[PDB]
């Protein structure tokens, strides 16, 4: 909103950045007034980004030194509520459209004191503002999905930062990657939140234009973190032409300044050096000097506001991977394969039963598993930025991942078994439908949660595919149906298979303990159906250790989670 | 090399461009001399882009209208012996180093009636004219594979070019995506090879910095497709000076010249074409009209000669694929795995050793064709650049491609069986075990041309990962393990299987024809030994189907890439 937008004079002084003891800074000195559009200018590794992140006050430590003062104090948490920083990637959902994307972030940043349509009201508000009203129902896509423009992605991503009302904004590269007048109206609108609207913007521009260039109040010009040059845009080729540096050929001003910033004019650096400590830097040390200044009911309800909201979201962008047309193909035809090689089924030949229930087995586990070890490694850049700027806590943003796989992933399994149930001639009735149809929903959620421990444990979403995949071949060959005779030393291996287990529970609600197709074969090829159908452990073990597996690979996927900060 | 570079006066008049009846050019008229270096400017567009390529021949038809002169004649086929065309994208293999990628393309290119010591003369004399002397030994990598430069991908890009002399130069925005002094440094070798080496060099800057444009000899700005102005570029202020337009704040030449050609001049575009077509125009159009000017086996060998030195780059380049360590991992697991759960193994458990035999079927089926379905898609924007340059001709290409993978492919599939045969207890013998072998790699090929086949059709490669995984998912299931009471209408299926034909291999092999496993089991669990390891098909029914299998669906990929032009 355009009112007096509280005001924040930042200074900073001698500030000195060291990573390992290459010198990033050494001993910039500048002070940034409300109502003012200072850019940073400079070479690339010359400590532009470096600045920026120190203003922004996100690179503290021992390898930061000097001050860095917000109304001749310090950096608390109180005044980075007040600090809005725009990064250079853009990290946004691609499906969801651009009301949608900014509707789910006022939600989320603004407190819950405020009414849910205020806060609508603040989302509306900053689409006008950046001008996102053409575009507001448009997708945001990425590079495989079509979207909106390349400037109003970044526009998407400055309206992030300008629903807190931020006093002071601190944007770093936003104008690289666009067009040569898109990138004029953004630092015409960037201009317009300093001069019109009482904010402190600082910005870093990677390679103004001629009339981009004509837009700045103060420049600040950096050579590898010395400083050239503070002051007044409009005031930056006098200065240098009373030091003794004049250009040859028509220029853009911004050209001429980066051609002395590293020392390559044409008839220096450290030339230019002592003349800025000379004749403008005690004079900028001056103005450092002369400018002078519920309950516990409510954190649980907090939460569940956050879970609500993200998962309302992941529901609108997370059902295009769930409901891809390849993957809906991949189980129809599946259908349509294993309805054909069974069709009409006698119970009677049991050993073609028994592939019938271990290829369910074999799918089902096979496929929520490789889909699920993609979903952690593909929001991690996502999660780290929108955990750190407030908006949930991991715990909220893991629960709605959790509850929102349990929606998406069980549609299709359901839809698998109520065609080929019928038409296979499996066990008739509605009590041994609802019974194969809960055992092998509960399977396909137990190997749902093994991808999603690997992908959380091994956050490269390639390296993880490789190690699901030879996880879920030793839990095949371990589940029961290829080798009879196993060796001594690998009887235990099947008792950690989730294939072991939904298997034996299927065969066990078909058959039965045995005994009623001993009424329809002899024996009671003997002691195929007493290793085969009666098996070894009970269902409720069945059950139960399917359900530690459950609850025991999401709580390894948490805490795979919470020891990266990622 | 820098001598007199026969010379080429070219010419165009009138060229008008439509495609579907939106006009890309409506009358350009300009000339380019020997030793000139043009460039061409103008916003997004404007047609820069398209009059580059009927500049370069390569865009021809009834779409094209006026008149391309080289040397005031028409484009044949022996003017563009000395045309050379740098696109915009750079298409190259990212694990050759930068001299094995320019010595290959300089066998390929260049004359065969040349020794090789010239053609390695010749590709050690472009990567010194380019200054790609510190880079040589580096590979070139890619966004993942960590290479050479942005500014050196570009210079890659021209060698390919320079190799075959070309007295006319033609580059789609080289300074693209390059760095301030990268894209000037690439500006001084483009103006060196006109001004030093004798060269027509004409290109397209997209935005020009305040010295790149000091270094363009003359200047073409457009528009839509107008052409406002043709000259020297220190003469292009002054034109428009003495038309009425002046520029106000100090700017970059061709700042002010991008401004005025889309008519937004601070204080008109409608005013500059008339003003072009009565001062500068009739000057132009007066200078086009002044300046007037083996036997058989001799092929066979050609061809020889062009596949081994294709065998030899893609041996170098697809084999951090198929000896990937994510790869070797998957099958050194796999046979832990199989060597662990059928341990020193009985015969005489029937049912246990076709389960082993079909899980190598079913390993070695679903793997190889998986691999082999994103061979083509990935290769489709360099085939089409290098087949359209010469270079190959499709049946080289694809030769090297089928020749290329019977070598890699089968060392994987050899160290499987090399570990589980003797572990796992199989038929003793060295025959036994090198018919094993035998069958398992005519099958590993005859299933790997499925996904070849797949893959050259459908040209995406997730489209076709998905086909390849149904067309594996009917060919297990008809496989002859899962289903031994087939109904009657899918018999038919298992026909077309190539699991089916690797499977009654492996089981003659290790069984015979029955009658010495009935000398262990009473019954000459009776009909046992009488659809399981007796079969329907012959031994040599099932070796010629495999045969058919790996010519065939090797036929198949050629023809399905031999309609796309790609």
């Given at each position: 909103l355009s009112s007096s937008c509280f005001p924040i004079t930042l200074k900073f002084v001698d500030v000195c950045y060291r990573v390992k003891e290459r010198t990033i800074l050494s001993g910039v000195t500048g002070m940034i007034s409300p109502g003012e559009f200072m850019a940073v200018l400079g070479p690339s590794g010359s400590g532009k980004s470096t600045l920026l992140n120190a203003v922004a006050g996100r690179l503290h430590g021992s390898n930061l030194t000097g001050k860095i003062l917000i109304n001749d104090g310090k950096i608390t948490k109180q005044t980075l509520k007040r600090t809005g920083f725009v990064a250079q990637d853009d990290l946004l959902y691609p499906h969801l459209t651009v009301r949608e994307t900014l509707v789910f972030v006022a939600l989320l940043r603004?407190?819950?004191?405020?009414?849910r349509d205020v806060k609508l009201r603040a989302a509306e508000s900053v689409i006008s503002e950046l001008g996102l009203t053409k575009c507001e129902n448009t997708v945001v896509g990425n590079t495989f999905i079509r979207g909106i423009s390349g400037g109003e992605r970044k526009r998407v991503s400055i309206a992030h930062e300008l629903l807190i009302n931020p006093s002071l904004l601190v944007l770093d590269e936003p104008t690289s990657g666009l067009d040569a007048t898109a990138a004029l109206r953004l630092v015409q609108t960037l201009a317009g939140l300093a001069h019109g609207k009482g904010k402190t913007v600082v910005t870093s521009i990677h390679q103004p234009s001629s009339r981009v260039f004509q837009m700045f109040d103060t420049v600040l010009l950096l050579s590898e973190g010395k400083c050239l040059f503070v002051g007044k845009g409009r005031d930056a080729m006098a200065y240098f032409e009373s030091v003794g540096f004049s250009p040859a050929f028509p220029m853009n001003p911004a050209d001429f300044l980066l051609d002395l910033a590293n020392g390559v004019?044409?008839?220096?650096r450290q030339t230019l050096v002592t003349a800025y400590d000379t004749l403008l830097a005690p004079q900028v040390k001056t103005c450092i000097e002369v400018s002078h200044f519920g309950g516990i009911t409510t954190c649980i309800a907090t939460w569940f506001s956050q879970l609500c909201i993200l998962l309302h979201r992941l529901l609108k962008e997370r059902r295009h991977e769930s409901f891809d047309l390849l993957r809906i193909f991949q189980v129809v035809a599946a259908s349509i394969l294993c309805g054909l090689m069974w069709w009409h089924s006698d119970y009677r030949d049991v050993h073609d039963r028994l592939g019938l229930l271990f290829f369910i087995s074999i799918f089902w586990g096979v496929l929520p598993s490789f889909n699920a070890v993609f979903t952690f490694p593909q929001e991690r850049a996502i999660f780290t930025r929108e955990r750190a700027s407030g908006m949930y806590t991991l715990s909220s943003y893991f629960m709605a991942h959790v509850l929102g796989s349990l929606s998406m992933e069980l549609v299709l399994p359901a839809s698998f078994l109520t065609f080929t149930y019928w038409m296979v001639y499996l066990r008739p009735g509605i009590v041994p439908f609802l019974l194969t149809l809960s055992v092998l929903l509960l399977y396909v959620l137990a190997s749902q949660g093994l991808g999603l421990a690997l992908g959380a444990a091994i956050m490269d979403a390639k390296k993880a595919s490789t190690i699901v995949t030879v996880t879920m071949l030793a839990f095949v060959l371990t589940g029961g149906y290829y080798v009879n005779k196993v060796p001594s030393g690998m009887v235990w291996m099947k008792y950690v298979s989730t294939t072991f287990y939904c298997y034996r529970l299927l065969v066990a609600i078909q058959?039965?303990?045995?005994?009623e197709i001993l009424r329809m074969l002899g024996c009671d090829g003997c002691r195929f159906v007493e290793e085969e159908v009666i098996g070894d452990v009970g269902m409720w073990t069945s059950v139960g250790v399917l359900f530690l597996m459950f609850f025991g690979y999401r709580v390894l996927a948490y805490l795979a989670l919470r020891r990266i900060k990622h």
């Open positions: 603004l407190p819950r004191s405020l009414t004019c044409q008839t220096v058959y039965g303990s045995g005994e």
